[PDB]
Amino acid sequence: GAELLSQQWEAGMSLLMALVVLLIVAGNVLVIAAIGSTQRLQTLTNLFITSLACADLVVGLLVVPFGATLVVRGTWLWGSFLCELWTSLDVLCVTASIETLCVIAIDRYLAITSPFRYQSLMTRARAKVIICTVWAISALVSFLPIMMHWWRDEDPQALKCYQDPGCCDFVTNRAYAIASSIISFYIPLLIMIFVALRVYREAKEQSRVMLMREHKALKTLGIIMGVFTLCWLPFFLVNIVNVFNRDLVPDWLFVAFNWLGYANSAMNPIIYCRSPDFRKAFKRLLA
Ligand SMILES: CC(C)CCC[C@@H](C)[C@H]1CC[C@H]2[C@@H]3CC=C4C[C@@H](OC(=O)CCC(=O)O)CC[C@]4(C)[C@H]3CC[C@]12C
Ligand SMILES: CC(C)CCC[C@@H](C)[C@H]1CC[C@H]2[C@@H]3CC=C4C[C@@H](OC(=O)CCC(=O)O)CC[C@]4(C)[C@H]3CC[C@]12C
Numbered sequence: 436g437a438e439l440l441s442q443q444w445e446a447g448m449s450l451l452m453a454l455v456v457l458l459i460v461a462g463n464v465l466v467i468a469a470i471g472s473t474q475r476l477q478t479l480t481n482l483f484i485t486s487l488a489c490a491d492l493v494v495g496l497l498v499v500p501f502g503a504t505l506v507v508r509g510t511w512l513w514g515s516f517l518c519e520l521w522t523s524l525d526v527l528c529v530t531a532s533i534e535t536l537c538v539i540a541i542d543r544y545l546a547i548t549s550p551f552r553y554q555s556l557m558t559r560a561r562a563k564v565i566i567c568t569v570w571a572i573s574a575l576v577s578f579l580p581i582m583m584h585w586w587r588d589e590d591p592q593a594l595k596c597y598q599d600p601g602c603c604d605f606v607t608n609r610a611y612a613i614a615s616s617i618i619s620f621y622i623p624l625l626i627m628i629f630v631a632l633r634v635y636r637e638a639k640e641q642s643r644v645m646l647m648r649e650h651k652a653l654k655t656l657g658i659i660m661g662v663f664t665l666c667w668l669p670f671f672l673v674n675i676v677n678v679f680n681r682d683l684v685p686d687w688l689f690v691a692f693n694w695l696g697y698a699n700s701a702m703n704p705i706i707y708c709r710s711p712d713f714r715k716a717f718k719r720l721l722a
């Protein structure tokens with residue numbers, strides 16, 4: 436009964452998790468292979484898209500598999516070091532993602548308001564430095580506090596979990612909860628929204644065919660930004676609400692919002708099918 440039920444559950448979740456992993460990895464490798472093999476998709480903006488696809492790829496190859504083994508098997512099987520490395524990679528990927536989205540918004544703002552200054556200022560070498568900087572800053576605010584144990588609580592519940600090698604709950608003190616949320620998420624969220632609204636306004640104040648084609652690409656970028664926020668904002672809101680009251684949102688919806696967050700990593704490849712050029716590159720590559 437209990438043994439038959441767990442065998443049905445384990446088998447069915449293991450399949451669902453495989454499918455998620457496959458969709459994230461196939462979809463983002465396509466985005467990277469498309470850009471890497473299509474001279475027409477090799478715009479500076481798409482270098483940032485590639486960076487974003489790497490963040491999602493790392494979620495597919497490392498973050499989600501590990502998290503699946505946890506959801507499926509009902510414990511952490513890989514020891515305390517890997518538990519921390521895994522959390523680190525989790526925080527890294529969300530941080531790098533939202534920071535990259537921020538850079539993309541800024542890139543477009545400059546492109547739209549000062550096309551000429553942009554032309555000369557913005558080159559491939561600089562696009563690469565920009566990308567490395569975002570990963571540097573993300574690595575900095577992700578790994579270091581986590582390997583320093585700045586996130587740990589002394590709660591009775593927190594201390595239980597820390598000793599137990601089967602527990603890889605990211606149970607953190609309130610300071611870290613607020614600090615890391617603000618630094619990894621909310622600040623770059625606010626920047627991205629502010630700059631995105633400015634790019635909207637500038638698009639509205641803006642031959643005719645070329646403008647509708649540009650605008651369609653902008654709206655694509657708008658969509659990946661909006662979906663990212665929808666996918667992660669709930670998690671991070673619940674993260675703050677927990678600091679003030681552990682009992683206002685049930686654990687299950689906190690775990691739900693966590694997976695909704697991971698689910699975002701499978702979405703961009705699909706959204707990029709709004710572009711003829713991406714669509715054609717995807718069809719050619721799947722051969
Ligand atoms: C285990 C964790 C820490 C993974 C860390 C991975 C990063 C080091 C990856 C993520 C995004 C990658 C970047 C994504 C995009 C580019 C653009 C790329 O420009 C190109 O020359 C190729 C495209 C072209 O110009 O045709 C140079 C590599 C670079 C900076 C990559 C360098 C390595 C990065 C930062
Ligand atoms: C590094 C740059 C980009 C960010 C600059 C923002 C900081 C100057 C400020 C803005 C809000 C401040 C935070 C506001 C609230 C908190 C929660 C605060 O309260 C507690 O956690 C004590 C509660 C408890 O331990 O029970 C800990 C400091 C912290 C993170 C503050 C740290 C300093 C912050 C991040």
Ligand SMILES: c1cc(N2CCNCC2)c2cc[nH]c2c1
Nearest residue numbers: 525526529605615616619693696
């Ligand atoms: C970035 C990503 C975070 N995560 C998002 C996905 N689940 C793991 C944790 C947290 C959690 C607390 N602070 C965070 C900062």
Ligand code: NA
Nearest residue numbers: 596597599602
């Ligand atoms: Na533990």
